[PDB]
Design a protein around this ligand. Structure first.
Ligand SMILES: [Mg+2]
Ligand SMILES: [Mg+2]
Ligand SMILES: [Mg+2]
Ligand SMILES: [Mg+2]
Ligand SMILES: [Mg+2]
Ligand SMILES: [Mg+2]
Ligand SMILES: [Mg+2]
Ligand SMILES: [Mg+2]
Ligand SMILES: [Mg+2]
Ligand SMILES: [Mg+2]
Ligand SMILES: [Mg+2]
Ligand SMILES: [Mg+2]
Ligand SMILES: [Mg+2]
Ligand SMILES: [Mg+2]
Ligand SMILES: [Mg+2]
Ligand SMILES: [Mg+2]
Ligand SMILES: [Mg+2]
Ligand SMILES: [Mg+2]
Ligand SMILES: [Mg+2]
Ligand SMILES: [Mg+2]
Ligand SMILES: [Mg+2]
Ligand SMILES: [Mg+2]
Ligand SMILES: [Mg+2]
Ligand SMILES: [Mg+2]
Ligand SMILES: [Mg+2]
Ligand SMILES: [Mg+2]
Ligand SMILES: [Mg+2]
Ligand SMILES: [Zn+2]
Lengths: 116, 177, 52, 80, 66, 136
RNA sequence: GGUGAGGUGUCCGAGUGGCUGAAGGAGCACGCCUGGAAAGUGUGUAUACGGCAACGUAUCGGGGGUUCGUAUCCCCCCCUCACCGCCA
RNA sequence: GGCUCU
RNA sequence: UGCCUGGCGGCCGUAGCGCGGUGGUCCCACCUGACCCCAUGCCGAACUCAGAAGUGAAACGCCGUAGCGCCGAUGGUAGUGUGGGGUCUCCCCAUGCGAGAGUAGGGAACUGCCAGGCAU
RNA sequence: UCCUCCUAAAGAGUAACGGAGGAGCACGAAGGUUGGCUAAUCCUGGUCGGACAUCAGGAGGUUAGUGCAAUGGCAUAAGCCAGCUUGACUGCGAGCGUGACGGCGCGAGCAGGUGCGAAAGCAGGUCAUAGUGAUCCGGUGGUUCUGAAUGGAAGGGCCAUC
RNA sequence: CCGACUUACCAACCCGAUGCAAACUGCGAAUACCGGAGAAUGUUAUCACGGGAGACACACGGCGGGUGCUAACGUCCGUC
């Protein structure tokens, strides 16, 4: 229901980046955690990934599902992407609103150095 | 939220006992109350609509959603898009507080009140009743009105069956019979 | 063919004009759009005038 | 003597169809399919026109293939 | 809820003839005096008494004796 | 006389009548009248052969009609030249291939069904035969 | 045989998509005048079926069809009116 | 002013 | 490496439904609250935010199950290209191709990348 | 004259006084973009309220919808709401389709400048296919291009347009 | 008014069985067509340009069809 309508809400821009050949950052948002992963243009393998389920990020935080955790995740995934040489991506909101934790994540990745 | 507290302390214990549910999430609960006034004569003039939304806005302190015709029918001389009614959805504390003022004040103020029906639960727990006259609520001033309206109340609850809602409202001493 | 034809005169002083149609019965108010003026190479407000 | 008819009309043939078939090397911009709807769909390196015309954005061979859960027919340009 | 469009919804006191003091949130503003509440409505006594069929044989035997 | 109540279209091409049939086996009843030849029947030929077997059984038993005339047949009027539109629909036919079971019957003996279907086949232009039900 | 138009309650008669289940009039019914009738005059006013009349539905030749909705629009069957059905 | 029949 | 879960794909019904069962450390879900970010042509329902008391009820996931859906031969049949023939509105012969429907049967998907949890 | 289906024989095309239907427009939003949503019908309950308004739940899963005919499409919706807007831009256009020709059509991309969006991106009218009329002549605005001795002008040319 | 019942009259949906379709399709050939590669053969048989034409009244026969009566040495198309 809500899961399916979120997928329907996301599957237009996903297919558009699929035909654009875009290396794509995928955000996923839960009430407790927030997830991020950089996916190759083939859509079958990832490059870097970050979350509030990881110990190295979650242990520095109060709650995993607030904006400060989402900015720490987008900073970590950006610093890993620039470590691996990935610089230009395209942000996939994955059916969420560009708002709140998603916006704070993408603003953190922009500030840390990704270009999107 | 007085009845919401009464739900959470005594109704849940009652229904868990009288149904032997495995989990407490398996219990019914009310979710929303819908207050429709179908005004089919407002195609003559907006002022009947404009006053019916004012009366129903005084009952429940929300601005009503003016509903319109889904399609056009000629037996009623209406076209698709005409405002033909008004509704109010009540959730949360305002739902409980209206439901308190309902079963405590307005139901006793019904002329020749003799009970409700237990045969109005739409097969799936959701109860629907219809009142003849808005003056049973004390929000309405008797001199200020001109037209005797009527509205209908629809309590949408999470009870799967019909009896689980009948026991839930009976747990709220809902005057069935 | 009730939909008469007009012209959208540049407000940049140039006599450049786009030509188009409108229903003058149902849209009595004048049409004003921001269009490209190829002489000045800017987007300029055009206004409705008579096709003449 | 007498009679008439009401069924004399017909329109001109619009010459639709597949102009370049599979395994057939094209230049960029070459029209592959003319069609009313999206009877076919645009795959890789293939654009869809205003009238659902499928044209090649690049050069190479035409590849017909069936993808998706709805088993829709996609046209792609292999590199060449 | 939205900010401006809704009417004032304020807690007032509604007392009744049975002395049922009840504080509710309402759009009235002033205090309310009732006539019957759910405590004092004759739903539990009056509707039980108010059928009152009466017997035809008992009226007959009542009107006299043989 | 059998006739469709509604049709999507008023007229139909002449077509052809080649191929074998599909309603070959005796489905419903016990005895059947199977077409061997090829051609087209009509609602009159169908209703006349139905009357001849209903009377031959004295309305005892049950008779199915497997076919139905759904093809309209046009004719041009007399003294009308070959142009100027398609002719007017005059009657309705059913295209009959070899092997088509035309009628079925039960509730009667075999010899009575033989003589009834013989009285019916005498009302039909095409050559017929008598068939019985079969397991598998 | 074809072309065109049309088919209106008791009668005539208007009525080319939304208070048209019908104007207006005559006629029919009822009342009054009249010793009695008329003529006047006044008031009304279709057939069915569902309940009970709360009003509802159907009915513009018949029968289908569309559009939310047709007495008005399209089709068929028809009926009638007008014109043509010629050259040899 | 004119206004039929019995 | 095993198990479980989440995300992104591959594939597009042997992958889908149905019926029954089962899961809560984590995850997920529901869930608590909302002056705030933001939102409701009314409503914190949704969207969003701040959270974590409770529950796996629903949903979801997993397991099982042939009531279906689905897949599906072999043989035959229909058709048909070429050549020939007949009783020529339609068929036949040689040769090549060869269905559909149906039957037996299969069948309660398979697989990749990353991350986390518990075991090892 | 134009559009859609069949005839049309599985590429295109294909005739008849063959079978059936439509067009000679509309829209300053019914266009663009961003964001969101998902029907028809039926069942039950429910004030006036009735076969049928509106309200709540369930089945169904597009049998609906598409500005209009039919066909092909449409869930990533091309269908439906709201916000901001004018890309219903100007100069070009590789390369193809289609016609005997005149002509008609599709088009990525380039330069300028613009709108929406955080951004990737999208936008050179509308889901597509009908909604149309050659040339001449003449009219209007702009442009020194020309200007019959010279300077102007008339007139002509070019661009837009009737 | 609520309704009584029974009943020799039909019937929606759904289910099962059975047919039909040029303007039906959850299937689907043979051929034909487009493109590529490869031999052998064929007096370049192919294409482009240029000079000169003629022709645009066809017929029957086979096959696939419309129309007509699966009537016509009929008519109108496709193909040989
Ligand atoms: Mg009417
Ligand atoms: Mg289950
Ligand atoms: Mg919530
Ligand atoms: Mg469960
Ligand atoms: Mg085989
Ligand atoms: Mg097979
Ligand atoms: Mg299965
Ligand atoms: Mg299963
Ligand atoms: Mg073709
Ligand atoms: Mg062909
Ligand atoms: Mg969108
Ligand atoms: Mg209802
Ligand atoms: Mg549109
Ligand atoms: Mg369109
Ligand atoms: Mg001339
Ligand atoms: Mg001079
Ligand atoms: Mg000069
Ligand atoms: Mg067919
Ligand atoms: Mg000629
Ligand atoms: Mg000729
Ligand atoms: Mg010829
Ligand atoms: Mg022939
Ligand atoms: Mg012929
Ligand atoms: Mg012949
Ligand atoms: Mg001849
Ligand atoms: Mg000829
Ligand atoms: Mg021939
Ligand atoms: Zn009281």
């Amino acid at each position: 229901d809500k899961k399916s309508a979120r997928i329907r809400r996301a599957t237009r821009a996903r297919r558009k980046l699929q035909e654009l050949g875009a290396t794509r950052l995928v955000v996923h948002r839960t009430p407790r955690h927030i997830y991020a992963q950089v996916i190759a243009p083939n859509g079958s393998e990832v490059l870097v990934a970050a979350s509030t389920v990881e110990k190295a990020i979650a242990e520095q935080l109060k709650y995993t599902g607030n904006k400060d955790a989402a900015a720490a995740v987008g900073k970590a995934v950006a610093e890993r992407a620039l470590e691996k040489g990935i610089k230009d991506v395209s942000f996939d909101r994955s059916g969420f609103q560009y708002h709140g934790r998603v916006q704070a994540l993408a603003d953190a990745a922009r500030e840390a150095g990704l270009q999107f | 939220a007085k009845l919401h507290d009464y739900y959470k302390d005594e109704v849940v214990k009652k229904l868990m006992t009288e149904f032997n549910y495995n989990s407490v999430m398996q219990v019914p609960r009310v979710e929303k109350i819908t207050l429709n006034m179908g005004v089919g004569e407002a195609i003559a003039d907006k002022k009947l609509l404009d006053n019916a939304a004012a009366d129903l806005a005084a009952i429940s302190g929300q601005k009503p959603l003016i509903t319109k015709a889904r399609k056009s029918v000629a037996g009623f001389k209406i076209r698709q898009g005409y405002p033909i009614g008004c509704k109010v959805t009540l959730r949360g504390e305002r739902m409980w507080e209206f439901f308190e003022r309902l079963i405590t004040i307005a139901v006793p103020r019904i002329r020749d009140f003799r009970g409700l029906s237990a045969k109005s639960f739409d097969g799936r727990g959701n109860y629907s009743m219809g009142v003849r006259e808005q003056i049973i609520f004390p929000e309405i001033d008797y001199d200020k009105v001109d037209r005797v309206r009527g509205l209908d109340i629809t309590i949408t609850t999470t009870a799967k069956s019909d009896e689980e809602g009948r026991a839930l409202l009976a747990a709220f001493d809902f005057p069935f019979r | 063919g009730i939909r008469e034809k007009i012209k959208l005169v540049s407000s940049a002083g140039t006599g450049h004009f786009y030509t188009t149609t409108k229903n003058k019965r149902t849209k009595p108010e004048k049409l004003e759009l921001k269009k490209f003026d190829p002489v000045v190479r800017q987007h300029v407000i055009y206004k409705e005038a008579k096709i003449k | 003597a007498g009679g008439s008819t009401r069924n004399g009309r017909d329109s001109e043939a619009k010459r639709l169809g597949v102009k370049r078939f599979g395994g057939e090397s094209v230049l960029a911009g070459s029209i592959i399919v003319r069609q009313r709807g999206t009877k076919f769909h645009a795959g890789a390196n293939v654009g869809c026109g205003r009238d659902h015309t499928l044209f090649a954005k690049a050069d190479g061979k035409v590849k017909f293939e069936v993808k998706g859960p709805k088993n829709r027919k996609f046209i792609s340009i292999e590199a060449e | 809820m939205k900010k401006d469009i809704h009417p004032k919804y304020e807690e007032i006191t509604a007392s009744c003839s049975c002395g049922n003091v009840m504080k509710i949130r309402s759009t009235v503003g002033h205090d309310l005096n009732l006539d019957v509440c759910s405590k004092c409505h004759p739903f539990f006594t009056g509707k039980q008494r108010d059928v009152a069929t009466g017997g035809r044989v008992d009226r007959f035997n009542k009107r006299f004796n043989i | 006389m059998l006739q469709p109540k509604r049709t999507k279209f008023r007229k139909m091409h002449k077509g052809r009548n080649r191929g074998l049939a599909q309603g070959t086996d005796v489905s419903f009843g016990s005895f059947g009248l199977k077409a061997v030849g090829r051609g087209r029947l009509t609602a009159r030929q169908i209703e006349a052969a139905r009357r001849a077997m209903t009377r031959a059984v004295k309305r005892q038993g049950k008779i199915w009609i497997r076919v139905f005339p759904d093809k309209p047949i046009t004719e041009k009027p007399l003294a009308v030249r070959m142009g100027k539109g398609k002719g007017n629909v005059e009657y309705w036919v059913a295209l009959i291939q070899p092997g088509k079971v035309l009628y079925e019957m039960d509730g009667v003996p075999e010899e009575l069904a033989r003589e009834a279907f013989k009285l019916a086949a005498a009302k039909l232009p095409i050559k017929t035969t008598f068939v019985t039900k079969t397991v598998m």
